[PDB]
Each structure stands twice: as C-alpha cells, then as structure tokens.
Amino acid sequence: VSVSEIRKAQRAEGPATILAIGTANPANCVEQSTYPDFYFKITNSEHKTELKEKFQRMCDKSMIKRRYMYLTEEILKENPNVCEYMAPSLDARQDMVVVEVPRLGKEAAVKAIKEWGQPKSKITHLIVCTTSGVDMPGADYQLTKLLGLRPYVKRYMMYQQGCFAGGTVLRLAKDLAENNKGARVLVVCSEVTAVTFRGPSDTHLDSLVGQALFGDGAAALIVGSDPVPEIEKPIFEMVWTAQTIAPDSEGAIDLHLREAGLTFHLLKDVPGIVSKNITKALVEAFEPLGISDYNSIFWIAHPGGPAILDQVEQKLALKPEKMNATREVLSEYGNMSSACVLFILDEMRKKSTQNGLKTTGEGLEWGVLFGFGPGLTIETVVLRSVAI
Amino acid sequence: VSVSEIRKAQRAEGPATILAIGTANPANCVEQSTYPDFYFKITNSEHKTELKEKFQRMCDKSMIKRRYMYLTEEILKENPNVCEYMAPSLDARQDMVVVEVPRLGKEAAVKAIKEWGQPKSKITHLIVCTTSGVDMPGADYQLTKLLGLRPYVKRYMMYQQGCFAGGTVLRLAKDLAENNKGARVLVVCSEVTAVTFRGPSDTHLDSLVGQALFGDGAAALIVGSDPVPEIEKPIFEMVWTAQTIAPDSEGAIDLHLREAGLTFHLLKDVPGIVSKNITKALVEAFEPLGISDYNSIFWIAHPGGPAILDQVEQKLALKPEKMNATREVLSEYGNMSSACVLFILDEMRKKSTQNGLKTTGEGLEWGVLFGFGPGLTIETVVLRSVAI
C-alpha cells in the first residue's frame, strides 16, 4: 500500500466554505428595559436600592434591547438555590442544560440542513460547542441521536469553551473540511445561561455585569471544501486563522464550574486589552494579503460588551457602519457566548443579500471575524465573501 | 490575491506522524492486591463484609498489579465528603484536579519535547484532553503558561471526553498536522481519578467496578507531517481514522458531573458490545488496504477492563501475544482513560526497539489503535510502523 497515494486521494482541494447558517433561541423573550425590576424581584433583592440602580445603569448602557432565555419566572420560582447569589445548585442547572443545549442546537441544525439542501447522511463530521454544562456521552452524542445523523459521524465535543469559541469552531472546521475529500461538517454552538444565572451581590459587580449581558441561542453551520457548483451555495470562505493570548491579561476573565454553578469574574479591563491588541492581530492576518485599510474589509467582532466594540472602533478609526451587523445581533440577542459571532455572520449575509449588495460581506471582498474570551484569548478568522 | 495559491502554500504534504512520546504519573503507587483493605478502611466501610468480598474479587480479576493515584491517605482523611459514596464534594475535587491535570501533563509534555529535541517555540498547536475537572481559562491555557509555549499556539481544549478519547486526540492531530505546513502539535492527555473516587454502596456495583479499574496518568505526543530527515524521528504514521456508535448500546457507559463529583454507571455488557462490533470496525479500516488477517497487524486496544480484551481476542482468534503491550499497561497502571492507549504506543515502540525488532510496531508494517468509551463509542486509528 502506498501512503502517499492514500494521502493524495484522501484530502480535499479548496478552501473550507460556509454553505449554510441556521439559528435558534428559547421562545422566552426578555425585554432589557424592564429587566432590572424583573431580576431583582425574582432573586428577592428588591430592598437593595443602590445595587438595583447600579444594574439599571448597566442594562441601560448594555445596548441590548432583548434576550432569549430558557429560564422563565416559573422555572426560577421552583429553583430558589439558582436565584441566590451563591447556593449549591449545579445538579439542578445541569439537569436543565444537559437537555436544553442539544434541544436548541437541534433547532438551529435542522434549519441549516434545510438551507444546505443535501441529505443529512452526507454529514461526515460534527462539532458541538457549549459553555453551559457537561455530560457523558456529551451533547455531540445527543445531537447525533436527535438529528438521526449516521452513527459513524466523526465528533468533536467542545465543552466549557467560553465567549471566544465561535472563532475556535471555525478554526477547527476549516482543517476538518480541507484535509478530507467530500467532508461536510455540521457545526453547532449552543449556549444557555441557566448555569451562570445567579442573584446579585454588591461586593461582586463583575458577576452582576454578566447578568446584564449574557443571553441564550444556538447557531449551526454546514462547512465544506469543494462545493458542488449550483447545487451547494457558498456563503463565506475561510482562508487563514489564528489564536493568541494577549500580554498582561492574566485573570482578565475567569469562570469556574462549582457546586453553585458557573461563576463569572472580571479582574482587568477587557475593552482596553482587546483594543490594545487588535492591531497586532490585524497585521498578522492582513499584512500577508497586502491590506492595511481596516475600513476596506468586512467585520464580525464578538460583542462581549458594547465597550469592547466602541474601544476597537475608536482605536482603529473604523467608520460607524463597520460594526453594524455586530451591534444588531447584540441589540436583538445579547452576548450569546460562542454562538454570537455565528449569528453575526448570518445577519451580515442576510442584510447584504436582502439589500442587493455585490457580495455576502457587505459588497467587500475580504473580512475578519474575532472571538474574545478567557485567557485573554483572541481568535482570528480571515474570510473571503462570495459574489451575490 | 489568489486563495488557491494561499491554500497550496499553506498545507502539509505527508501523513501525520508521531515524533515523540513522553508519559508521567503521580508519585503515589497503590498496590492492587491490598487495595480492597485500604479502600474499605479509608471509606469507613469495613462493616460491609459481603460488599468488600465482592470488591476483592473485582480487584483479583482486574489483571491490574498497581495504579498511581494523586489521592493519598492524607488527602482522603482531609476530605471525608470525597470518601462517602455520595456527598457534596465537587468544589474540593475541582480544586485538586484543576491544578493536578496541568501539573501532570506538563511532566509528560516536557519528556516528549526532550525526546523530540526541537525548540518548544516550534510547537504550533496544542491539544489537551482530560475527563477530570473543567475550568476557564482551561488546562490548555495552564499548560501553555507552565511549558512556556508561544502565546499564539493554537489550542484545542478537550474536556469531559472519556476513555475513549486517546483515539479522538489522534484523529484530531492528524488533520491539524496534515493541513498545515510546518505545524507541530503537542498532544497531552492527563487523567486524575480524584473526580471519580467515592465510597462503596452495595446497590451500585457498577460504580464499585470503577474504583477497581481507574488509575492516574498523563501521556504527551509531538505530531507532525513532513518530518525533517535525521533531525526528527518518526515513530508511527497515521493513515486513516474513524469514530462510530455501536448499535444497541444506549446507556452502556454514562458519567454525570454532579455536586458529588463524577458518577460512573454501567448498564450494558461493554465487553460483549465491543466484541460484537470490532469486526465491522476492522473491515472498514483494513478492507481498503487488502488486509483481513488480524494477526498480521500490530494492536493497541483501550483496556477498559480485562474482559474487553479477552472477548476481543476470543472473537477474532487473536494470538495471545497481540495484546501484550496493552495488557502490560493495564497491569502496571490500570485504566488511565484517555491517556491509556498513548502509554500503550509508548510500551510497544520501546519493547520493539529494546528487543531489536525491525519496526516500531512489533516488526509488522500496519497496526490498529482502538478507543472505547461512552456512546458506546469506538474510535479507530490505522497506523503504519517505522523501520527500526
């Protein structure tokens, strides 16, 4: 047997391409304007006047209009340990998210498969990504079951990943599609805040900020190299990826899975660290392509908070329109952790097509997608649009 | 800018190759002959006489002479919640393994990098895999810091994976090395039983079986395509991989992460399912290669328990020597979950080289490595040996 023959016959030829995007969110919609009143009443903290004022300002500055949440008032009233700031509550939280993560991801995945138009039996790889809960067999096994994928689908279960992982799953699917002839990767990010929700405490305002920002959602992609012309429909192409850890950012964002659920901590200035290091990330990606005008590429940035977006825009002098798709997803859905950046790609390509632009990346050729999260980690994906 | 030029210049040419292997284990060595006495005492269950006799039979049939355990008598005496069959103890368990996982992985990784002999700054990708504990930033971030890797190393944090993911990390590193010119992947699997350890209960004999089998260990690999002749030293080549879910195996092995730590459940006959499904996995892998004599290839099987090995050997009529390296690792270390198969590759190539055989695969050309675990999942990696 010749391994070099086997190897040339095994691998794909072209760039890993996004061929379909589908999204889903819990039915329960939570208005941001009145969230403070609702959250202080459900967590029994109505008597903390200075603290609720603090949360009202947080919610007012978030630039989030609404979020979708698996957690309802009814569910929360049955779980006082989840409504406390710190009470043993992981078993109850796990019981919710071990079921909700695959459920919600299945909705998003069905949508993406329908868009793609090809038999689910041609799905050869599955990436499932979440930051809410873990189990064995994982959510990857659950989604194989729920979707009726072939039992020999090759699975990649990405657990406890964090806000920066929409970039990581793309980085992964790129190598899976490109190195394997005929491979079609289903990619699912599904994030539920039932593991992080907790009551307010005036000595942990970083935990509280989280309660203003994180929302639920799943996004699914079909990724593959060598699309069949006129049968499959390219949306975006991946060209180059990177992951780095920003200097001076030790302990900026930490989340620990405990008996009281997933705690959320912010010890450094995230917006300032991201803004200070985004240029270096851009030159590593775009210098080899000869591009240095960052207003000439389309943008996708994980909206960890609005201040990240503002401080990046200001550092680079981005025109205000560059972050439009990013800010629309933040407005309608809040920070959905790893899924957010995938919703943004959907928003951008949908708006570009609806508005008659020349490419799926706002009429521009090249673009960038950034994931930001614990480490402080920056994930970079270089994208090329598709004509029409 | 041409994406096809970029794609041709970006990818590697040859098969992903294992270039170094290093292992490590906690210093505390626990003899199996006297474990029943020690465990029924540290868990305050000396009254449970019938149960303890059942354990001694489990331990005597295990074919495990010793195991290395991070947990010591001193640690167990400071953690009575850990020694109960089911007491709130995840926070204590997480505090142990969030630190011991990357500590032990770093020992293994330093050994492999020393074998490899190239500057650690040439490590471009890092896969870290564990079934014990989770945290954010992960053990991948911790090992990047502990080892001094470049902060732009591309990371793949595989958490809550199970016995079966020694195969998974090889499946993963194959695509990473093969699709990226110059990529050198450090792979670390590091497994500590402090999240599973718990007292006995005579109504849960499946959990008790876990206490007789699982041990601690880390194994590290350097994986890359296009090795530099006579600078780098190939050990094994990967040629083809697969992952499947055996029919009729729902709920065979389940592990849940709870406030009381990671529970372990066995509801089906694992040895029976693995043995009924192994032929199908071998014909998928070897039919395309023209090979059907399973005694003509070298073998690496995850030793979940000894009955898995006995029932596979019997089904296939394997000669008794085929499972030698597997059994020697089971004997000296126990089931180390995802790290186990990697120690078995290390034992086989070291014995082959020590005994003056012609290849690193016991003098044979082609081999197979199998990972077995929750799902019921079977991971298959086809390997070619290297001369000398």
A 306-365 residues with CB below 8 A of B?
Answer: none
- Let me know: does A348 contact A280? Beta carbons within 8 Å: no
B244 with B254, same domain: the answer is yes
Report chain A residues whose CB lies below 8 A from the CB of B156: 168, 172
Domain that holds residue A300: 235-387
Residue ending a domain, choose from A188, A208, A234: A234
* Rounded Cα distance, A197 and A215, in Å: 10
Residue ending a domain, choose from A186, A214, A234: A234
Nearest chain A Cα distance for residue B12, angstroms = 10
Angle between helices B90-116 and B139-147 (to 10 degrees): 40
- Residue corresponding to tokens 């990784």: B109
Give one word for B356, left, alpha or beta, with left for phi > 0 and alpha for psi -120 to 50: left
A135 with A224, same domain: the answer is yes
For residue A324 the two structure tokens come to 């439009």
For residue B23 the two structure tokens come to 């292992």
Q: Which residues of A are annotated as a binding site for CoA?
A: 54-61, 307
3-state secondary structure of A91: helix
3-state secondary structure of B100: helix
For A260, how many CA atoms within 13 A lie in the half-sphere containing its CB? 12
A54 with A197, same domain: the answer is yes
B130 with B17, same domain: the answer is yes
Q: Which residues contact A386 (CB under 8 A, 6 or more apart)?
A: A234, A235, A236, A237, A359, A360
Do the strands B298-301 and B257-258 form a parallel or antiparallel pair, or are they unpaired?
Answer: unpaired
For B184, how many CA atoms within 13 A lie in the half-sphere containing its CB? 21
For residue B233 the two structure tokens come to 């030293």
- Residue corresponding to tokens 């995840």: B90
> Known binder of ligand: residue B148?
no
A211 with A334, same domain: the answer is no
Return the C-alpha torsion angle A186, A191, A195, A199, nearest 10: 180
Detail the DSSP E strand segments found in B251-364.
253-254, 257-258, 261-262, 265-266, 298-301
* Rounded Cα distance, A251 and A374, in Å: 8
Nearest residue on chain B to A131, judged by CA atoms? B136
A243 with A363, same domain: the answer is yes
> Known binder of ligand: residue B106?
no
- Residue corresponding to tokens 């996995």: B281
For residue B48 the two structure tokens come to 């449970």
> Known binder of ligand: residue B56?
yes
- Let me know: does B66 contact B26? Beta carbons within 8 Å: no
Report chain A residues whose CB lies below 8 A from the CB of B155: 168, 243
Exposed / middle / buried, residue A10 (Cβ in 10 Å: 0-12, 13-18, 19+): middle
B218 with B270, same domain: the answer is no
A289 with A356, same domain: the answer is yes
Return the C-alpha torsion angle B310, B312, B315, B316, nearest 10: -120
Residue ending a domain, choose from A202, A218, A234: A234
B214 with B284, same domain: the answer is no
Do the strands B184-191 and A125-130 form a parallel or antiparallel pair, or are they unpaired?
Answer: unpaired
B67 with B83, same domain: the answer is yes
Q: Does A256 touch chain B (CB under 8 A)?
A: yes
- Let me know: does A110 contact A147? Beta carbons within 8 Å: yes
Q: Does A154 touch chain B (CB under 8 A)?
A: yes
* Rounded Cα distance, B322 and B326, in Å: 8
A311 with A248, same domain: the answer is yes
For residue A204 the two structure tokens come to 């942990």
Quoted resolution (Å)? 1.9
- Residue corresponding to tokens 């906690």: B26
Detail the DSSP E strand segments found in B111-252.
125-130, 154-159, 184-191, 217-224, 236-245
DSSP conformation letters of A289-356: GT---TTSSEEEE--SSHHHHHHHHHHHT--TTTTHHHHHHHHHH-B-GGGHHHHHHHHHHHHHHHTT
3-state secondary structure of A241: strand
Return the C-alpha torsion angle B268, B271, B273, B275, nearest 10: -170
- Let me know: does A260 contact A86? Beta carbons within 8 Å: yes
* Rounded Cα distance, B213 and B304, in Å: 8
* Rounded Cα distance, B237 and A67, in Å: 49
Pick from B251, B277, B291, B272: which is nearest to B378 by CA?
B277
The structural domain count of chain B equals 2
> What is the set of active-site residues of A?
163
A256 with A230, same domain: the answer is no
**CATH number of residue A304's parent domain:** 3.40.47.10
Which residues are paired to A238 by β-bridges?
Answer: A383
B 224-243 residues with CB below 8 A of A?
Answer: 237, 239-243
Q: Do B91 and A10 touch (CB under 8 A)?
A: no
Q: What is the phi/psi pair of residue B108, to 5°?
A: -60, -45
